[PDB]
Amino acid sequence: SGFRKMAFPSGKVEGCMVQVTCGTTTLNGLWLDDVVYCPRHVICTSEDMLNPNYEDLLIRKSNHNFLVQAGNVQLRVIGHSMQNCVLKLKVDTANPKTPKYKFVRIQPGQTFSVLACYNGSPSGVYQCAMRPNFTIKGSFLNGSCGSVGFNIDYDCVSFCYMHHMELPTGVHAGTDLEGNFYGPFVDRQTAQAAGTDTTITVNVLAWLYAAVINGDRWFLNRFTTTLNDFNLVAMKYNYEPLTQDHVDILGPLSAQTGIAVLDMCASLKELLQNGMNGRTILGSALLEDEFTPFDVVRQCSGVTFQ
Amino acid sequence: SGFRKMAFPSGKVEGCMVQVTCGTTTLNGLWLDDVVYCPRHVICTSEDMLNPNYEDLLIRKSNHNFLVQAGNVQLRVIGHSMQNCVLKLKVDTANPKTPKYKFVRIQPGQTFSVLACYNGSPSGVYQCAMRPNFTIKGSFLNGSCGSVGFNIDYDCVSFCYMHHMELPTGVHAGTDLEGNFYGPFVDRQTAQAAGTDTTITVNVLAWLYAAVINGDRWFLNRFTTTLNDFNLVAMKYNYEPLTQDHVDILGPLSAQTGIAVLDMCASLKELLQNGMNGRTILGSALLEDEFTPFDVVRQCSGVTFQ
């Protein structure tokens, strides 16, 4: 038993991380086969970063302008191109540690592990959720650009996120590995800001089931509610609408605990209207919304990866 | 910016993890050079596990009774011995992935990363603190024994914890890598229980500094307090006494924020006596005590590992 914010083992991604330097900008790259992927704003100077024509900026670059360091080994760049907001540096060496991988784009509400990196060296790993407003509440300092987010499915690394920038509220914005931003953000200097968020209702319900599995039952009740009546409360507390597909996804957890999904909705309704009255759930005094139903089943059952 | 519960990159430990089976018990082992380390209760049956003479149990074992699997490769055991509560299985092959390592025992209040494993396959990584009562609030299911906790210092893995068992409150108990239990727990069947815990005061102060660094200032004040007067409040709320060495350790964070340690103590005093009044700190409605001053400086500054 127990429930922790749990990241995937990071080894498979650690072996892909390299340092990319161009001009005076140093950031991280992801080295898979003979390509290094990194944010295209690496080609920018501090005055470039004010309304860039990236195509013009890139045609003025040379392969030798890109210093790529894999550990203490230099990688010769032999080609360069842009794909949307990422740069693809072709190197003369395929990464012998390339895991089986996929580039996947995730949905707001889904989680992934982030391997925070500086100077091509992994620093830490932690779990993030894609917020409904397409930001992530990460932990990133200067030099962290090019750090990736990912999930692992058996032996296959599904990369879903590349870090680009921090927004004024201290949250983070980036792209998928095709270079397409999550959300309405751009890699040019503007007053862009996160914009309004909501709470991920289905995840809170999953976490309430995690709590019950782990012995926290004080918020349970014999009350029930209808889906529509719950969704009226959800709206009032800035929670995402609950769909029948969410209810279906919560089936296995409902079955394991014997608490009907709509009963757990009634419990969430009371927690929203009443608060917790000085009590905690899984060591939290807040309703947690960054665990998916998958995450709860993963941890309250025990799957591994090879 | 941002602040997350952050584990160390797990790759160096992933390459050490193996599966140890003896009789009908399967658990994890740690393979370093030509030794596999694992909990000695692997030699126990469900009726052995009632008042064992482990020395008698072990003399009845043979090398071939121990099936050691490193991935899909079997490791021939060529010797076996006990060191306290761990077993040392000598194998005919040194682990080519052995990192530079040390066996260190940590202090209550210190943190470490746990690589949860099942069947020798890493499942997840997360950060834990050694509670003052020598338990850890982990996430462990059956088969997780032999999962290790560790810190990484530049390139060197300091192993500090091997998992053995879950206590009736759902918290976890284990040993250092010399096989010496953390706390008053034994690897035989008893009604042993955690016993009373306290809050790690110096860590809460570190986390309050993390909050200030990250822009959370609402709990600050111009009040100050004395060390003795703060420690009277600490006692009343079941917080650990704050020592002058704790104050000294908090110096760099105090200096970076410009908030005297004793001023932050005054703030903690008010938070203890008043609560938060519906506000949060670093996304928490509770005072968090599982980040050390080191952890805060690591994340609010950005160190890496090679």
Ligand SMILES: *[C@H](O)[C@H](C[C@@H]1CCNC1=O)NC(=O)[C@@H]1C[C@@H](OC(C)(C)C)CN1C(=O)OCc1ccccc1
């Ligand atoms: C790349 O390593 C870096 C990572 C951020 C620095 C602080 N936290 C981060 O996540 N990203 C940046 O520095 C990006 C590049 C610039 O963005 C464009 C103009 C769109 C190209 C500026 N920027 C950024 O994050 O600015 C906000 C910021 C906040 C805090 C500190 C520095 C910068």
Ligand SMILES: *[C@H](O)[C@H](C[C@@H]1CCNC1=O)NC(=O)[C@@H]1C[C@@H](OC(C)(C)C)CN1C(=O)OCc1ccccc1
């Ligand atoms: C080893 O993989 C296993 C891990 C625990 C199972 C559930 N959560 C865990 O952390 N450890 C055990 O099964 C240990 C071995 C036995 O302990 C001795 C008698 C001291 C040898 C029993 N045990 C244990 O953890 O019992 C409590 C328990 C709680 C919940 C589920 C199963 C067992």
